[PDB]
């Protein structure tokens, strides 16, 4: 029979086989179920799709046709859930969000 | 060389599926690789800890789903659970 990838079987773009191999060779459990790599690939693919789509929207708003660490950082930090997920994470060359305290601005 | 084995081509496939005309730089590619590795390690470690707490020896999609619920905030967990359930059902249907 012709070989069908588990990624194609599950309708994913992330490698179910490689994820299964990493789960087995990472010393996580004695054995690994059949659907655990599929679930892991699906969740990872959804997360990277969401982050990449927000970053691409930011890049388009910046009149750019290429995602850079600045756009990645903007997308992550402008979303509360992604900020909570990546609160203790530093993104290289990402900069900071433009933010100035109100009391530092001139009064009139 | 020793086949560094990154996630670059999968991330590029996802990027071309969500934003067909948008590209990516090498630094952003590396940052995305780091993100995928970090999240994989987090969820795998949580699933292993769940299995050890419950005196199980196998990691199952139930373990992965519970780890996803524990680690992702709010609607992120809901949508990731939906995606994982859909993929598992499709794979089971062959």
């Amino acid at each position, epitope marked *: 029979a012709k070989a069908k990838s588990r990624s194609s079987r599950a309708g994913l773009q992330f490698p179910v086989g490689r994820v299964h191999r990493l789960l087995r060779k990472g010393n996580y459990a004695e054995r690994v179920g059949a659907g655990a790599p599929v679930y892991m690939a699906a969740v990872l693919e959804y997360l990277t799709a*969401e982050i990449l789509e927000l970053a691409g929207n930011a890049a388009r708003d910046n009149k750019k046709t290429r995602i850079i660490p600045r756009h990645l950082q903007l997308a992550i930090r402008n979303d*509360e859930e992604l900020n909570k997920l990546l609160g203790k994470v530093t993104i290289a060359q990402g900069g900071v969000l433009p933010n100035i305290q109100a009391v530092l601005l001139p009064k009139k | 060389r020793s086949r560094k084995e990154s996630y670059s081509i999968y991330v590029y496939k996802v990027l071309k599926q969500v934003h067909p005309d948008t590209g990516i730089s090498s630094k952003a590619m590396g940052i995305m690789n780091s993100f995928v590795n970090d999240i994989f390690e987090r969820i795998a470690g949580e699933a292993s800890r769940l299995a050890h707490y419950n005196k199980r020896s196998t990691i199952t999609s139930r373990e992965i789903q519970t780890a996803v619920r524990l680690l992702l905030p*709010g609607e*992120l967990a809901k949508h990731a659970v*939906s995606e994982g359930t859909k993929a598992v059902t499709k794979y089971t249907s062959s």
Partner: single-chain antibody
Amino acid sequence: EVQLQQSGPELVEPGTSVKMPCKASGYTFTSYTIQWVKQTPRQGLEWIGYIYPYNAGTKYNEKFKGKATLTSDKSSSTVYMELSSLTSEDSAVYYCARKSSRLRSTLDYWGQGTSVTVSDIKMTQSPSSMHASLGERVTITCKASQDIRSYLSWYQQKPWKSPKTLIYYATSLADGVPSRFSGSGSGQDFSLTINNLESDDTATYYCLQHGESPYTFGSGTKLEIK
């Protein structure tokens, strides 16, 4: 648990300004955006804009910029909308509805509506009005103008009530919706199917896209039962 209180009807003099509240409860107020929708019998549902309480970020419809202004108050969990230079073409019911920052999510919970009376992608619904019996199968089509990657939702509006979400992501069932309703389609062609009907299925069914910046609703489909 999640409930979005609003104000009552407001008779308003022409040329003035009006602010209406959207006090929110039952959820983390800062993690969800608050979108504003106006409904007229002339043009159905229209999208004004939203505000993100987490970073006080806004985005308005191009036809609604200047006319509408959105502010947030994190202390009392309240979102206000201001209409300036009230022209006679402003008499409508304004809805505030919750929507998560996730691109897949849609308007899940709505407010009762405030009746204010003054003294792009075109989304086409094929059936303008339909008739059916008590136990038949019906199908509504929402052919789109441009390609939206499964970012489409379906709503059911009983008369003189706020819309209720049924389908999001063009296939996923909403929270609490029975499995009779089933959505399908992607790209430019979408379909809503109610499997077996009931007397309480008599309402108007709308379809909303949120794949691009100005959200556009469907023309509407009035469904009659027996």
